[PDB]
Every structure is written in structure tokens, then in C-alpha cells.
Amino acid sequence: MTEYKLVVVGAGGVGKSALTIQLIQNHFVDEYDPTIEDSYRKQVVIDGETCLLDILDTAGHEEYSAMRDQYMRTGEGFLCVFAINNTKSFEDIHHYREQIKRVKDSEDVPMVLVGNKCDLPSRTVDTKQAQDLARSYGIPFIETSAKTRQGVDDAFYTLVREIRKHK
Ligand SMILES: COc1cccc(-c2cccc3c2O[C@H](CNC(=O)c2ccc(OCCN(C)C)cc2)CO3)n1
Ligand SMILES: Nc1nc2c(ncn2[C@@H]2O[C@H](COP(=O)(O)OP(=O)(O)NP(=O)(O)O)[C@@H](O)[C@H]2O)c(=O)[nH]1
Ligand SMILES: [Mg+2]
Numbered sequence: 001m002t003e004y005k006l007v008v009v010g011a012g013g014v015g016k017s018a019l020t021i022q023l024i025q026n027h028f029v030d031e032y033d034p035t036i037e038d039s040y041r042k043q044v045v046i047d048g049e050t051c052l053l054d055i056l057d058t059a060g061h062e063e064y065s066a067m068r069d070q071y072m073r074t075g076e077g078f079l080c081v082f083a084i085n086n087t088k089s090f091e092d093i094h095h096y097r098e099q100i101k102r103v104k105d106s107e108d109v110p111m112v113l114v115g116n117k118c119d120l121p122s123r124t125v126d127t128k129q130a131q132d133l134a135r136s137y138g139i140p141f142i143e144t145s146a147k148t149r150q151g152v153d154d155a156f157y158t159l160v161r162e163i164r165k166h167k
Helices: 016-025 066-074 087-091 093-104 127-137 152-166
Strands: 002-009 037-046 049-058 077-083 111-116 141-143
Touching (some): 002 016, 002 152, 016 037, 016 049, 016 111, 037 152, 049 066, 049 152, 077 087, 087 093, 087 127, 093 111, 111 152, 127 141, 141 152
Parallel strands (some): 002 077, 077 111
Antiparallel strands (some): 037 049
8 A cells, every 4th residue: 555654743732742643543642741753653545545654743842953854854744733822833834844845855845734722712823824824835724623633634634635646
């Protein structure tokens, strides 16, 4: 079956691990254990093609490393995640897109913008703002909650569909 290498990126605390663990294990993690680098694997069927998702879950709180750039170079597509209750994480998205475009050395990298924590009442980033940012990058936007499971499959499966279009 076909293999897709997906990297989940974004600011500390936005829910990159919670999203991934919700996808793999059908489990919400309540505790906040910061990530350095963790990898996961899942077989799924998307649009009738059976495929193997290799998912790399990154750190938020991370300076420069040559190691960070190796795994971003091998990654075929990226979930750029922010939290809808944290405007700074949304502003940081543009930094992640630049970091990616630099290491891949391309304008046209498969990406999906993910607004996580949509279950929380303390919304500070508007759906319309995030849609406009996504439209400006020519990429999809998906609102998710690792807690309710809303959008989780959609986020990963949409990224795979983006990788297919690109090749
Ligand atoms: C066995 O394959 C798996 C399993 C789970 C996740 C991933 C995965 C997902 C997203 C991005 C990834 C991934 O692993 C890739 C392979 N793993 C690596 O650890 C890796 C090995 C060598 C690298 O250098 C690249 C070229 N040259 C120096 C050898 C770089 C990385 C790294 O990027 N791959
Ligand atoms: N209410 C709510 N909480 C969430 C959601 N997603 C993650 N969280 C919470 O946010 C905290 C951070 O989750 P985590 O997955 O650790 O975020 P992260 O981006 O992996 N952090 P890091 O980059 O430091 O590894 C956790 O306590 C978790 O319960 C969500 O959709 N809703
Ligand atoms: Mg994490």
C-alpha cells in the first residue's frame, strides 16, 4: 500500500499530540506532556486507496537544530496547528509555513491549517480570519477538537488528499 509521511507542527500547547493520539488510539490526553519528537503509524482507507500514514509529532518549544530540519525535509505534508483560544499560536503559523518552505525549498508544499480546541468557550481567533489566512496560502482549513474528536480524521485525510493532488 501507499505510504504518506505527515508532520504535525505548531506552537507549544496547541494540541499536536492530543490530535495525533486521538487519531491513533481513540483517546483524549488530558495531561500536558511536552514533546520532543514522537512517531506513529496507522493504516487507513481514504477515497478507496489503502494507505499507511507515518505521522511525526513535533515540539513547539524548540530552538534551531539540524535534526529538526532533517525530518521536515523527508516529510511530504504538514498539519500547521494553532489553538482557537490562543492568538499568538495563530500568529506563529506564518513562521511555521516559512520554516517549511525554506527546508523543502518550494512554494508548493502540501499543507492543512488546523484550528484546534474548538470545544473551548474562550475563542479569540475567528473562523473567518483563519479561512482568509488559509485562502491566502491556497490551502484547506479545518476546525478540530482533540477532546470531542471533531475534525480529527478530516484533518489527516484532507492532508493525504492534498499530497495526492501534488503528485
Ligand atoms: C519508518 O518510517 C516512518 C515511520 C513513522 C514516521 C515517519 C516520518 C513521518 C514524517 C516525517 C518523517 C518521518 O520519518 C522519516 C525517516 N526517519 C528518519 O529518522 C530520518 C533518517 C535519515 C534522515 O536523513 C535524510 C537523508 N539522509 C541524511 C539519510 C532524516 C530522517 C523522517 O521524516 N516515518
Ligand atoms: N479542551 C481541549 N483541550 C485540548 C485539545 N487539544 C489539546 N488539548 C489540551 O491541551 C494541552 C496541550 O495538549 P498537547 O497535545 O500536549 O499539545 P502539544 O502541541 O502536543 N504540546 P507540545 O508542543 O509542548 O508537545 C493538554 O492538556 C490537552 O488536554 C482540545 O481540542 N480541547
Ligand atoms: Mg506534543
